Amino acid sequence: DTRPRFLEQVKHECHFFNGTERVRFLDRYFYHQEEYVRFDSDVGEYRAVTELGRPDAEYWNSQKDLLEQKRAAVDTYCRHNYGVGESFTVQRRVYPEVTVYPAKTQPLQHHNLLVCSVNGFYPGSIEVRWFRNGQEEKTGVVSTGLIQNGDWTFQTLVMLETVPRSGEVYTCQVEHPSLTSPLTVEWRA
Amino acid sequence: EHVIIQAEFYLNPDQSGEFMFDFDGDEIFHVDMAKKETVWRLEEFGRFASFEAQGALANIAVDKANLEIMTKRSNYTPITNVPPEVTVLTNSPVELREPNVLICFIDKFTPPVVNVTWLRNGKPVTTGVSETVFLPREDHLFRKFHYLPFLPSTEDVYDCRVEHWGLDEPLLKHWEF
Amino acid sequence: GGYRARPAKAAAT
Ligand SMILES: *[C@@H]1O[C@H](CO)[C@@H](O)[C@H](O)[C@H]1NC(C)=O
Ligand SMILES: *[C@@H]1O[C@H](CO)[C@@H](O)[C@H](O)[C@H]1NC(C)=O
Numbered sequence: 001d002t003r004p005r006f007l008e009q010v011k012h013e014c015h016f017f018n019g020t021e022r023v024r025f026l027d028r029y030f031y032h033q034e035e036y037v038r039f040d041s042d043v044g045e046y047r048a049v050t051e052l053g054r055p056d057a058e059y060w061n062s063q064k065d066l067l068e069q070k071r072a073a074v075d076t077y078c079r080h081n082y083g084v085g086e087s088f089t090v091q092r093r094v095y096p097e098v099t100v101y102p103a104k105t106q107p108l109q110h111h112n113l114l115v116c117s118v119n120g121f122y123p124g125s126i127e128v129r130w131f132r133n134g135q136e137e138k139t140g141v142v143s144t145g146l147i148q149n150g151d152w153t154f155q156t157l158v159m160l161e162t163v164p165r166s167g168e169v170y171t172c173q174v175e176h177p178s179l180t181s182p183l184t185v186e187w188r189a
Numbered sequence: 190e191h192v193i194i195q196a197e198f199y200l201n202p203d204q205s206g207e208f209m210f211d212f213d214g215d216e217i218f219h220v221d222m223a224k225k226e227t228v229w230r231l232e233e234f235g236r237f238a239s240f241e242a243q244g245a246l247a248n249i250a251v252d253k254a255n256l257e258i259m260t261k262r263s264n265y266t267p268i269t270n271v272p273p274e275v276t277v278l279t280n281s282p283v284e285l286r287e288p289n290v291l292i293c294f295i296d297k298f299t300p301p302v303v304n305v306t307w308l309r310n311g312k313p314v315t316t317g318v319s320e321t322v323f324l325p326r327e328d329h330l331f332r333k334f335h336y337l338p339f340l341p342s343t344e345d346v347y348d349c350r351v352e353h354w355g356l357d358e359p360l361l362k363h364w365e366f
Numbered sequence: 367g368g369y370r371a372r373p374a375k376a377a378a379t
Contacts, residue, residue, distance in 0.1 A: 001354070002354075003202055004265075004267030004268070005200060005201065005202070005203070005267055005268045005300045005302075005354075006200070006201045006202075006256060006259075006260045006265075006267060006268060007198060007199075007200050007201075007256075007268050007299065007300050007301075008198060008199045008200075008252050008253075008255055008256035008259060009196070009197065009198045009325075009329060010196070010197045010198070010248070010252060010374055011194055011195070011196050011197075011325065011329075012194065012195040012196075012372040013192060013193070013194050014192065014193040014194075015191075015192050016190050016191045016192070016193075017190050018190065019190070027372070029255075029377075030329055031259045031263060032268040032269070032299070033268075033299060033328070033329040033330065035329070036259075052259070052262055052263060055262070055377070055378040056377050056378055058378070059377075059378035060375060060378075066375060073372060076370070077370055077372050078193070080370055081193060081210075081369055081370055082191075082193065083367070084238050084367040084368065084369050085212070085217060085234070085237070085238050085367070085369070087237055088231075088233060088234055088237055088238075089191075089212045089213075089217070090191060097281070099282045101282065117281075117282045119280065119281050119282070120280070120281070123213065124213075147278065148214060148215075149280050149292060149334075150215075150216075150292070150294070150321055150324075150334035151230075151231070151280075151334075152215050152230070152231060153280070155280065155281075195371060195372055197374070208371075210369065217369075218369075237367060238367045238368070238369060239367065239368045239369070240368065240369040240371075241368070244370075244371035244373075245371060247373070247374075248371060248373060248374040251373075251374035251375070251376055252374055254376060254377075255374070255376065255377045258377045258378075258379055259377065
């Protein structure tokens with residue numbers, strides 16, 4: 001099918017700062033991927049983002065009833081929906097499972113790669129650190145970055161390039177808002 | 190701190206519409222337009238909150254009418270296909286005979302139309318697979334997840350096959366133990 | 367706790 005496609009998108013956005021203290025609402029309309037008109041609660045009326053949206057800005061701004069409906073959205077819509085799901089969204093805390101296993105940088109060489117798999121945590125903010133004999137190793141660290149599993153859990157791999165010597169102890173240390181003290185897992189050669 | 194987005198789209202000539210709520214990049218729920226039902230991303234969500242799906246269907250009707258209006262304004266300028274980037278991964282470290290899940294992450298594409306197939310040893314797999322709706326991005330492209338629970342074994346190889354109008358050939362992303 | 371949908375607005379014709 002080579003027929004041309006045409007796409008309309010709308011995004012109603014609620015931005016929260018310090019809980020529901022400061023809230024900002026954006027009513028955004030899109031043609032394909034181009035935003036053409038938006039309502040910013042900081043401004044109080046619609047503004048054309050491109051020339052394609054000027055007829056909507058003028059027309060919608062002439063409807064005083066619609067405008068005050070949008071100007072109250074930070075209360076009637078943003079703050080309301082925040083309170084509806086706060087218990088299982090804002091306060092959702094899942095602690096990660098931390099696995100450590102070796103790998104190879106070259107398929108025939110020796111194990112020169114320590115993988116710290118950090119799986120199933122929420123929210124995404126996390127800090128992973130590598131240590132060798134109680135000393136933090138900041139060189140040779142590669143990661144996948146933060147990976148979103150799409151099911152309200154995150155994961156990440158933090159890998160340390162090193163040549164393990166016998167007797168060395170490596171520990172991967174994880175900090176996450178669901179923990180009250182760092183989570184450490186050791187690996188011995 | 191936090192961002193909640195009510196994202197909607199309507200697509201011609203496919204006549205596909207969608208409606209969903211996003212929290213910090215995760216889906217809270219979407220509305221099945223056919224069943225006119227609220228579909229919670231996690232079953233727990235449906236026990237603490239509710240949503241009447243009729244409000245979603247009314248918005249989709251307006252978006253349909255607006256799209257015809259905006260198509261005229263643009264002088265019928267169609268969308269440009271943006272092919273996706275596909276990643277295959279497991280949600281936990283892989284152990285033999287220990288059940289796991291394969292995740293196919295399809296990212297940064299538009300329009301939101303895609304044909305996704307799981308393949309085990311080159312053959313299509315349908316048992317136990319699941320998927321998400323099209324998820325919104327801040328650059329206003331889309332992303333999507335497909336899942337395949339599986340028992341890891343050295344006897345099997347897997348591929349996620351993704352076809353998109355922005356791709357010449359189907360995109361195959363491989364995985365093996 | 368019921369979620370509220372922010373209504374779409376019909377464009378100018
Ligand atoms: C569509 O064509 C008309 C007539 O030339 C022109 O005035 C208008 O600016 C065009 N709009 C776009 C988006 O190309
Ligand atoms: C998906 O496959 C169907 C046929 O099964 C085809 O009509 C359609 O164009 C395909 N869509 C994409 C995006 O490749």
